[PDB]
Amino acid sequence: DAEFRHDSGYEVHHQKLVFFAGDVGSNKGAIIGLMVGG
Amino acid sequence: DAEFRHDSGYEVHHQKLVFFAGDVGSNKGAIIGLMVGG
Amino acid sequence: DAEFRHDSGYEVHHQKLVFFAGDVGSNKGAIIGLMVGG
Amino acid sequence: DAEFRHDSGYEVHHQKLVFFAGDVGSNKGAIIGLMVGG
Amino acid sequence: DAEFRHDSGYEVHHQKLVFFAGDVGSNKGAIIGLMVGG
Amino acid sequence: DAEFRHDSGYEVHHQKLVFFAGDVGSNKGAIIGLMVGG
Amino acid sequence: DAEFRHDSGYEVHHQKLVFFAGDVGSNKGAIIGLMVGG
Amino acid sequence: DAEFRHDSGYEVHHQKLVFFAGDVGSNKGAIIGLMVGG
Amino acid sequence: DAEFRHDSGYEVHHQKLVFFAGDVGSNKGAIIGLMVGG
Amino acid sequence: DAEFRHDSGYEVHHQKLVFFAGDVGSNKGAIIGLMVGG
């Protein structure tokens, strides 16, 4: 007579002027805010 | 008669002018705010 | 008759002008705020 | 006259009988290999 | 006269009997190999 | 008749003008605030 | 006349009978190999 | 009839103009505030 | 005339019967190999 | 005319029957090999 209960909790996010909001599992590419050449 | 209860807690985030908000599992790429060349 | 209870706690974050807010499991890439060459 | 060169390197992975192979940016859910109740 | 070159590298993966092969950006759901109740 | 209770505590963070706010499990890459060459 | 060169190195991984192979940026959920109740 | 209770305590952090706020498990890479060459 | 060169080195990992192989940036959840109740 | 060269060195790891192989930046959760109650 087992009982398995899981709750992921309450998440509230307030964000302003955020370039990258989020979780990246794996990153091998390029993440650049601004690129100026020449 | 076991009882398994898990709670991930309450998360509140307030962020302003944040380039990268988030959790990266693994990072092998490039994360640059600004790139100026020449 | 065991009881397993886990709570991840209450997390409140207030951040302003933060380049990188977050937890990195493993970092082998480059994390640079600003790159100027030439 | 700047030169920006980035290389993410050579990655070779050999895995056998691995439940979870991969990078998780953020984890708030449940990751259980086996669940038995009652 | 800037030059921007990015290479994500060579990735070779050999996997056998792997339940979950891949990168998860964010996980709030349930990932269970086997569930047995009653 | 055992009882297992775990609480991760209350975490409050106030941060302003912080380049890198977060916990790094392992760091082999480069973390530079500003790079000027030439 | 600056030159920016980054290399993430050579990574070789050989793993057998590994429950969780990978880097987790942030973990607030439950990671259990086996759960038995009742 | 054992009782296991763990509490991680109350953590309050106030930080301003902090380059690196956080705990590093292992560091083999470079952490430099400012790099000027030439 | 500056030259910036970074190398993350050569990493070889051989692992057998390892529950958790990987780097965790921050851990607030539960990581248990085996849970038996009742 | 400066030259910046960084090398993270050669890392070879051989591990067998290791519960937790890896570097944890910050730990506030529970890491238990085996939990038996009742």
Residue numbers in the entry:
A (entry chain I), B (entry chain G), C (entry chain E), D (entry chain H), E (entry chain J), F (entry chain C), ...: 1 to 38
From the paper:
To determine the molecular architecture of pathology within fresh, intact tissue we developed a cryoCLEM workflow that we applied to 11-14 month-old AppNL-G-F mice. These animals have a humanised mouse App gene containing three familial Alzheimer’s disease mutations (Swedish, Beyruthian, and Arctic). In contrast, the Artic mutation is situated within the Aβ peptide coding sequence (App E693G, Aβ E22G) and is thought to increase the generation of Aβ protofibrils.
To identify amyloid pathology within fresh tissue, mice received an intraperitoneal injection of a fluorescent amyloid dye, methoxy-X04 (MX04). The backbone conformation of the Aβ peptides were arranged as two ‘S’-shaped protofilaments that form an extensive inter-protofilament interface. In both type I and II fibrils formed from wild-type Aβ1-42, E22 is surface exposed. However, in Arctic Aβ1-42 fibrils, which only differ in the E22G mutation, G22 is buried within the fibril structure, at a point near the intra and inter-protofilament interfaces. Thus, it appears likely that wild-type Aβ would be unable to adopt this Arctic Aβ amyloid fold because of steric clashes created by a Glu at position 22. Alignment of available Aβ1-42 structures from post-mortem human AD brains, and the two distinct Aβ amyloid structures from AppNL-F and AppNL-G-F mice, indicated that residues 20-36 form a very similar structure in each fibril (1.35 Å and 1.31 Å Cα RMSD AppNL-G-F with Type I and Type II fibrils, respectively). This conserved structural motif adopts different positions with respect to the fibril axis and the interface between symmetry-related protofilaments, giving rise to the different amyloid structures observed.
